[PDB]
Amino acid sequence: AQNDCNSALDQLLVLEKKTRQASDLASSKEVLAKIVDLLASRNKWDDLNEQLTLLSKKHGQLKLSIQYMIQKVMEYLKSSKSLDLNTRISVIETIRVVTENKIFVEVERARVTKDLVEIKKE
Amino acid sequence: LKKGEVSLGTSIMAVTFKDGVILGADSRTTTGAYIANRVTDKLTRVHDKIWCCRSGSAADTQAIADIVQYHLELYTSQYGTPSTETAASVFKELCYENKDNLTAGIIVAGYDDKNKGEVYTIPLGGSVHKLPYAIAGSGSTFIYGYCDKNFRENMSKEETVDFIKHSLSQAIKWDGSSGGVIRMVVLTAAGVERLIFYPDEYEQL
Amino acid sequence: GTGYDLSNSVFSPDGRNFQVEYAVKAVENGTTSIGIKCNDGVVFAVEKLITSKLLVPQKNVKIQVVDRHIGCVYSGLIPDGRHLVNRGREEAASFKKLYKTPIPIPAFADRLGQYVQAHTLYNSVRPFGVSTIFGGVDKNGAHLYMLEPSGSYWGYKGAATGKGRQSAKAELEKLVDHHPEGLSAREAVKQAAKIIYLAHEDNKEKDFELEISWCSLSETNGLHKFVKGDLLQEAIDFAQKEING
Amino acid sequence: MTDRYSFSLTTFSPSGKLGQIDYALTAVKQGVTSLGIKATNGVVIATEKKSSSPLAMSETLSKVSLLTPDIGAVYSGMGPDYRVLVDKSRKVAHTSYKRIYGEYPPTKLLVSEVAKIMQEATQSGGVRPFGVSLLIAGHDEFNGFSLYQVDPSGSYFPWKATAIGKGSVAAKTFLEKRWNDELELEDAIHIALLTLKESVEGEFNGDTIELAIIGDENPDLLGYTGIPTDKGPRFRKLTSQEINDRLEAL
Amino acid sequence: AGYDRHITIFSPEGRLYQVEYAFKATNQTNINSLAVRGKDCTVVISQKKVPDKLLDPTTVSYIFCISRTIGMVVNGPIPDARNAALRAKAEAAEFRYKYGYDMPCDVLAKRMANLSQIYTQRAYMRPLGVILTFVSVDEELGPSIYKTDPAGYYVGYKATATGPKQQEITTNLENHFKKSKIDHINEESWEKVVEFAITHMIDALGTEFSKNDLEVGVATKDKFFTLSAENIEERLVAIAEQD
């Protein structure tokens, strides 16, 4: 609540300022992972999806790491189910690291998709 | 051989102030006693921050000035921005070799940002003379006392603006080949500002 | 033998005719000259080779003035250098008479520069084949320029050329980097001597005579002067210090 | 410097050939389709003005030049060669007939001048001919309506209708049948459009085609919006909009 | 073909050795330039190749100020670029002296085009390998880009690109101009146009650029000015802090 909110803003601003499109100190992958789980607890699933899409257009820290944050996120929505399943569609179409080639180890890309397919089939 | 001859307003000046130079003129061409021109542009740009006042024969000053304009355009593009002293020499060269046909009384006044404002006065026959301020034409002797005594360096723009408007408006009254508009040109680093005041204005003010 | 080696009345498939390329190659097997830009001046130095005891010390000079405040030294083919300078003079004087001022270094550079380009667009008029390090001080600072065979010139902050170029450039960049640009004009004289002394290590089957000059705004008072007397002894002292001695 | 190539750079052989010229004649063929029709009811010229890059505009490219207010010219070949020869052609037309004789030049006599320049740059050593062929179309009361070709050779001839550049042989042929002695200027604009349609497609629209006519004119641009001293010049070049509109009714 | 290097004769090909190689050699300085026009501005951005620490980074130029309005970028070897620059500067001033009117882009293009054609015709001068991109915001012609290429051919352009990576840049300009349905930039403030330009340039050439890797010349109605190091930085700064 109040905790999630302070923590999320602080780690987010600093990661963007250090990492940039070119390093000044950067932020490790751990820093962005922390930020991700903070923002999922904080605010709604549609807002998480939107904020993640917007970051990833910069360059990320690398395209691979972006796929790792998707993969986590997908699992979490599938735990909760119902309307949360609807949002799963939403992450996938918006972020082009998992709907288009941006890199050539994209095993995580095929895997996310198969998770979505399985649900759709239900 | 030129048939008839022409004359200009013969009380011209460049005055240094706080941040540069303010250049001041009366303008009037007559051809005899026919008033060829009420107003004139004889407030001549020879470069973007370096203007001049032209006096003497209209035909001759304009013909020279055009040549000076060509050299100082070419001069800028190649050898870097001029100086007031650079412009002044070019004007002089053209007068001196052809002082057999030319009558040009020139004040070239320009602003540089490491010399501040500069006045170089080139009389008839042509010689470069650096002064901190100038008055020229033939009406200048009569205001020599005023000009020397009230000339002050680093005077407020408002105060210099009054001083030039007044300086000329007195000169124009007592002298007879003077007349028409008073036009003034402020040269600082912010650019070039143009003033025109008509007869009915300046006489009064 | 293609008419891209016997004529310059055409453009080449390499964008330059072979003979101009060859001028660049002949500067480098030559004699060493440097130029050091500093925050208030420029310093020039050239290595004068000693081949006999029949030569006289400093009664043959390679650094020649243009005007009174621009100093010119060049490396490469001797005749071509005389002709370049003679021209350099005619421009300089024409400028002083005509505008009533000593000539700017970016201006002076455009005038020599256009003339080196001219002799490189005709099929029977010889190219130049000297690289000229030149410069001086004017009313908005000090400037160091270097002119090439091909008509190529840019402003430099350090410049080096010749046999011992590699060595020279190494020491020279270290010192320039270390300094704001080159520190004082005075410090730069000694430094300059070390580079020339260091370059001489690349050719010990001959002797040298160190020759320095300078042109500095407040440390020559706008003039170009030869560096001599005490100031030459001191730069020698510094040089023989580091390169052991 | 000069004085190294003072032998001519055309020479003969027993086949009588002039090296430079044969090569230059080839260049004309490799130009774009330009044509001329004299309809004996005016003169109509059309050519293609075409891009050479996707961000090149064609409304900064013309192949139709005015030589004088009432003599127009069109070409195929080298672009540069045409502009430089055109400057010199302009020079003589203006200084030597409009000041000396006070009037516009007669076409055939201007045909003699332009030829003489081209033949001259071949006769003199150290320089080559121009690698173009021009069609000079003009009108005068005295001569009627007229059309000549001047070759890269500096030879000339008159031609009732002709075409030069790519697709020369077929374009002239189709035209010869469609050419009547007594031919209406609107039909003669269609035939020109029709021909250029056969040379090019997939980039053929009316705003990339530049057509100019000798006959109809606008007095309102010749300073005779008011009371005339006379009617004045007969050449008037179409804008794109006029061309496109007619292309729809082709 | 012909044998253009030994005598000034034609080729049956129509294009000569002097022309053909002038088309090629115009890049060996590892340079790329583009010019776009705004609604009411014209911007040039050009690579700046300072390859050493023996040279001052702001004496290396490739953008010349020919007139007070007119700018010219020369894409070619530097002696040829200065040979063209010297001639262009005189013709620009001479035209103002005689005809009382400063030089526009198209008339300078024409003069030089005619000269280049003559030196190809001559056997007593060489032609140069220069592509001259002339730019301004002319008083009657609006915003202008007119580019000449060697041959003595010249034509007017929407926008243009030069350098080996011409093709990469082109696809980005095309995509914008179709989308917007006009052949100029909708924007009208030279800052936002400069910023846009750089964006499409980073994307095409694939490296993020510094101020010392760029050199900017801006044309506006009645003035031409070059942007300094700080000035370039201010634009760059925004492109680094948005996605």
Swiss-Prot record, chain A:
GO terms for cellular component: COP9 signalosome; cytoplasm; proteasome complex; proteasome regulatory particle, lid subcomplex; proteasome storage granule. Belongs to the proteasome subunit p55 family. Present with 5710 molecules/cell in log phase SD medium. The chain holds residues 28 to 149 of 445 of the full protein. It comes from Saccharomyces cerevisiae (strain ATCC 204508 / S288c). The keyword Acetylation applies. Transmembrane segments: none annotated. This is 26S proteasome regulatory subunit RPN5. Acts as a regulatory subunit of the 26S proteasome which is involved in the ATP-dependent degradation of ubiquitinated proteins. It comes from the Eukaryota.
From Swiss-Prot, chain B:
Its EC number is 3.4.25.1. It holds the Pfam family Proteasome. It is found in: Cytoplasm; Nucleus. SUPFAM superfamilies: N-terminal nucleophile aminohydrolases (Ntn hydrolases) (SSF56235). The active site is at T10. GO terms for molecular function: endopeptidase activity; threonine-type endopeptidase activity. The keyword Cytoplasm applies. GO terms for cellular component: cytosol; nucleus; proteasome complex; proteasome core complex, beta-subunit complex; proteasome storage granule. It catalyses: Cleavage of peptide bonds with very broad specificity. One of its GO terms (biological process) is proteasome-mediated ubiquitin-dependent protein catabolic process. The 26S proteasome consists of a 20S proteasome core and two 19S regulatory subunits. The 20S proteasome core is composed of 28 subunits that are arranged in four stacked rings, resulting in a barrel-shaped structure. The two end rings are each formed by seven alpha subunits, and the two central rings are each formed by seven beta subunits. The catalytic chamber with the active sites is on the inside of the barrel. PANTHER family: ATP-DEPENDENT PROTEASE SUBUNIT HSLV, METALLOPROTEASE TLDD. Belongs to the peptidase T1B family. The side chain of Thr-10 acts as a nucleophile, and the N-terminal amino group acts as a proton acceptor. This is Proteasome subunit beta type-1. The gene is PRE3.
Curated annotation (Swiss-Prot), chain D:
Signal peptide: none annotated. Keywords: Cytoplasm, Isopeptide bond, Nucleus, Proteasome, Ubl conjugation. It is found in: Cytoplasm; Nucleus. One of its GO terms (cellular component) is proteasome core complex, alpha-subunit complex. The 26S proteasome consists of a 20S proteasome core and two 19S regulatory subunits. The 20S proteasome core is composed of 28 subunits that are arranged in four stacked rings, resulting in a barrel-shaped structure. The two end rings are each formed by seven alpha subunits, and the two central rings are each formed by seven beta subunits. The catalytic chamber with the active sites is on the inside of the barrel. Belongs to the peptidase T1A family. This is Proteasome subunit alpha type-2.
Swiss-Prot record, chain E:
Gene3D superfamilies: Glutamine Phosphoribosylpyrophosphate, subunit 1, domain 1. SUPFAM superfamilies: N-terminal nucleophile aminohydrolases (Ntn hydrolases). SMART domains: Proteasome_A_N. Pfam families: Proteasome (PF00227), Proteasome_A_N (PF10584). Its main location: cytoplasm. It comes from the Eukaryota. Keywords: Acetylation, Cytoplasm, Isopeptide bond, Nucleus, Phosphoprotein, Proteasome, Ubl conjugation. The keyword Lipid metabolism does not apply. InterPro entries: Ntn_hydrolases_N (IPR029055), Proteasome_alpha (IPR050115), Proteasome_alpha-type (IPR023332), Proteasome_asu_N (IPR000426), Proteasome_sua/b (IPR001353), Proteasome_subunit_alpha6 (IPR034642). There is a cross-link at K223 (Glycyl lysine isopeptide (Lys-Gly) (interchain with G-Cter in ubiquitin)). The modification Phosphoserine is found at S228. GO terms for cellular component: mitochondrion; nucleus; proteasome complex; proteasome core complex, alpha-subunit complex. It is found in: Cytoplasm; Nucleus. One of its GO terms (biological process) is proteasomal ubiquitin-independent protein catabolic process. Belongs to the peptidase T1A family. The 26S proteasome consists of a 20S proteasome core and two 19S regulatory subunits. The 20S proteasome core is composed of 28 subunits that are arranged in four stacked rings, resulting in a barrel-shaped structure. The two end rings are each formed by seven alpha subunits, and the two central rings are each formed by seven beta subunits. The catalytic chamber with the active sites is on the inside of the barrel. Interacts with CIC1. PANTHER family: PROTEASOME SUBUNIT ALPHA/BETA. Present with 15200 molecules/cell in log phase SD medium. This is Proteasome subunit alpha type-1. The gene is SCL1.
